[PDB]
Design a protein around this ligand. Structure first.
Ligand SMILES: [Mg+2]
Lengths: 51, 714, 50
């Protein structure tokens, strides 16, 4: 579990595209989503998921 | 450093972070926890709880039966089903007193439902124990088979087309001296088989519960259905109930009750909340108690109504429980495996079974009749939930300060399985006395509250059917995250359903904006993978990739093509509600627009309205444009009916002559065949008149129509 | 100066005391060119003009 909750060298997720943000809440949502993705775009658990 | 997320509950209160205590997101992939041994344990424990009652011998099935009603008062805290009829009647009397006219109006609505209902409603149930073939079968096929058998046995009341007529037909059947079952052998040659069932055999088959938890036969669907209609009508008018409301109304009910009990509390009153569960709900609900409460409910009513409502508890009180497939025996010396059906379990030695199974068989042998165990006391799940809720609400309503005659008084909800009491009193002695009185009254009525699963804390926090209340904040996790994968109807239907479910979760399920965006991303990726419709530009080398590439190289406005045709995804929190074909209609190329929406394409199929732009999961409705991507996927695949599809074959060729038949339930007094005959004659005449048909076809059509007339007259 | 973001529908104002050290991406071509020209003079939020 400890090795699972740690980061890796490369990115283990390539989530697809969405429509362009227009609404301000869409922009806040994009910000939050990108921050979370960067937070867990390389984590080990993501490697497990993709594999 | 060791990761230990449970320590997180030292800062974030448990209710706030409850999402972490729910492991699975979806159905766990094992689906275990059932078997014949479990049914044996259930029967043994149910008869144990009621053991101190009277033992009688039924005059029809000859099986022993148990009667705990009006039994000796419980002396210990073990679960007891020794309910008293006088006490339940007094509780119902007080409930009517505090809600006058509820029983009467509920009875009127139930009478309306009884009068108007139809037979075909019973094709909307779940897997059903077809007694005719003596096995589980679909509701529709089981109903068709029962209708066939009744027709072959000279019972055709259900032909009228009314559910109560089918109930009268069952009434006629069960008093019949013998029942004849006919079966076909479908290969190599076809034959016939006839079987004769005496009165007792058919009687036992009618009062059986196939266990796979259990499902009764078509004999006992209608009566429970009508009793459920009555219970639902009564509960709809009760504030303390928990059914049959949805997710949004549950929060309102919880908030209302908690505010009512807390604010009304004065500065000198102490309040407590008991979050509780019932020890064993369906194992201590004696059918006689429900019969007594239904008798009280249907006082001063038409006799036919009283009897239709009273049959269900009467039928359930003498019910039989089946013992499933049987047992498996394995020998290591010769690595030899065999299956022993439960039927012979009555007359098989007790050396092949371990100690626990030996005890089970020893206890269940005296109650075993014709391979089925007679379970008079107790009940099964999923049938009398609402009436049990009514009884619980009655005992709760008994708590009003006027009844208690003392300072303490209680209230709260009841959703059958679980509940949440709230008790107000001057001192902690008052709280103790109130809880003691509530517990003793629940015991007298025959209800056991799970002492281990029930805990009491000062008012402000509790739980109720997966709804966690904390100082006004209610957290909902009854269903948890839904399934965001492609549902699997077709391309357009799956896309619309996915976007719509994301939107509905955002509106109701408190889902977040970023969470919705990620869910949309995951769904679009899953869709593209599943349907081999990857982007026309991208190279993934699927079976469909070449044609998508050619299409992409052909068109001009590549932003207009659908996702399933190799186009960009254009959804967002903005336009989740817009159907795809509309959302990018303006961008669509003229030729692609014409082809994709050509209504003469051979890939479009539409079914009856009830299955158009709607999917069954509960059911949900989606919006989509009927394009070339609305195809329907291929179908995958002892029977009383000679041709299982005779009815389906018959309804078809009606839609041909009368397309409107697909849309609205057609109504007419003429038989069908004459309807097709007249329509065909008129159509052929007008077709000849136009000039697109010649003389030979007209002559052939009229000869054929005349011949059909002669065939039907004779 | 006054900046506005149409995407988020927001408005803000910045004083001249912070104009000495600030990004030039916000402003347009002419305004950024003028800022570039006058950057080496702003002393304590006050240009020097002999
Ligand atoms: Mg509870």
């Amino acid at each position: 579990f400890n090795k699972a909750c740690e980061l890796t060298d490369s990115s283990w997720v390539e989530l697809d595209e969405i429509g362009e943000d227009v609404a301000p809440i869409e922009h806040i949502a994009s910000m939050r989503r990108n921050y979370f993705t960067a937070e867990v775009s390389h984590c080990r658990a993501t490697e497990y998921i993709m594999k | 450093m060791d990761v230990n997320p449970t320590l997180l509950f030292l800062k974030v209160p448990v209710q706030n972070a409850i999402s972490t205590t729910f492991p699975y997101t979806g159905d766990p992939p094992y689906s275990h926890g059932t078997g014949t041994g479990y049914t044996m344990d259930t029967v043994n424990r149910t008869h144990k709880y009621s053991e101190k009652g009277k033992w009688t011998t039924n005059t029809e099935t000859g099986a022993p039966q148990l009667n705990p009603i009006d039994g000796p008062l419980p002396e210990d805290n073990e679960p007891s089903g020794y309910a008293q009829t006088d006490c339940v009647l007094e509780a119902m009397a007080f409930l009517e007193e505090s809600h006058p006219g509820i029983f009467e109006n509920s009875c009127l609505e139930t009478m309306e439902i009884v009068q108007q209902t139809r037979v075909d409603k019973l094709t909307q149930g779940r897997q059903t124990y077809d007694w005719t073939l003596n096995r589980n079968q679909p509701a529709a096929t089981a109903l068709a088979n029962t209708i066939e058998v009744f027709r072959s046995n000279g019972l055709t009341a259900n032909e009228s087309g009314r559910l109560i007529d089918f109930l009268k037909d069952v009434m006629d059947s069960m008093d019949k001296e013998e029942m004849e079952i006919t079966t076909h052998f479908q290969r190599r040659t076809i034959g016939k088989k006839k079987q004769r069932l005496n009165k007792r055999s058919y009687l036992i088959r009618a009062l059986t519960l196939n266990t796979m938890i259990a499902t009764p036969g078509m004999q006992i669907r209608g009566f429970v259905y009508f009793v459920e209609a009555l219970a639902r009508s009564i509960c709809e008018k009760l504030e303390q109930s928990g059914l049959p409301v949805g997710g949004n109304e549950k929060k309102a009910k919880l908030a209302n009750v908690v505010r009512k009990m807390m604010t009304n509390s004065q500065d000198t009153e102490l309040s407590f909340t008991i979050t509780g569960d019932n020890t064993k709900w369906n194992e201590n609900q004696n059918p006689r108690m429900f019969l007594a409460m239904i008798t009280y409910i249907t006082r001063n009513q038409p006799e036919w109504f009283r009897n239709v409502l009273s049959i269900a508890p009467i039928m359930f009180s003498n019910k039989m429980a089946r013992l499933g497939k049987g047992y498996m025996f394995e020998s290591k010396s010769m690595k030899l495996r065999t299956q022993v059906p439960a039927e012979m379990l009555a007359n098989i030695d007790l050396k092949y079974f371990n100690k626990s199974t030996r005890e089970k068989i020893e206890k269940i042998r005296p109650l075993l009749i014709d391979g089925t165990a007679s379970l008079s006391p107790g009940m099964m799940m999923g049938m009398f939930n609402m009436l049990s809720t009514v009884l619980g609400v009655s005992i709760l309503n008994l708590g009003q300060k006027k009844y208690t005659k003392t300072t303490y008084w209680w209230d709260g909800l009841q959703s059958s399985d679980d509940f949440a009491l709230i008790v107000n009193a001057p001192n902690h002695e008052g709280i103790q006395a109130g809880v003691d009185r509530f517990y003793r009254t629940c015991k007298l009525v025959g209800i056991n509250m799970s002492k281990k699963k029930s805990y009491i804390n000062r008012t402000g926090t509790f739980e109720f059917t997966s709804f966690f209340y904390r100082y006004g904040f209610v957290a909902n996790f009854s269903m948890e995250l839904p399934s965001f994968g492609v549902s699997g109807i077709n391309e357009s239907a799956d896309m619309s359903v996915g976007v719509t479910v994301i939107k509905n979760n955002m509106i109701n399920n408190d889902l977040g904006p970023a969470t919705a965006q990620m869910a949309l991303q995951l769904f679009i990726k899953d869709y593209r993978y599943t349907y081999r419709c990857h982007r026309g530009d991208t190279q993934i080398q699927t079976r469909r990739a070449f044609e998508l590439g050619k299409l992409w190289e052909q068109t001009r406005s590549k932003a207009g093509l659908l996702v399933s045709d190799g186009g960009p995804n254009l959804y967002n929190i903005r336009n989740l509600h817009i159907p795809e074909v509309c959302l990018k209609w303006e961008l669509m190329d003229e030729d692609y627009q014409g082809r994709l929406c050509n209504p003469m394409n051979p890939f479009v199929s539409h079914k009856e309205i009830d299955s158009v732009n709607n999917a069954v999961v509960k059911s949900m409705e989606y919006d989509a444009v009927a394009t070339t991507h609305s195809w329907i996927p291929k179908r995958n695949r002892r029977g009383i009916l000679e041709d299982e599809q005779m009815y389906q074959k018959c309804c078809n060729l009606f839609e041909k002559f009368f397309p409107s038949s697909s849309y609205r339930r057609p109504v007419g007094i003429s038989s069908m065949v004459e309807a097709m005959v007249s329509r065909a004659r008129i159509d052929a005449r007008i077709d000849f008149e136009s000039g697109r048909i010649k003389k030979e076809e007209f002559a052939e059509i009229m000869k054929i129509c005349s011949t059909i007339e002669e065939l039907r007259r004779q």
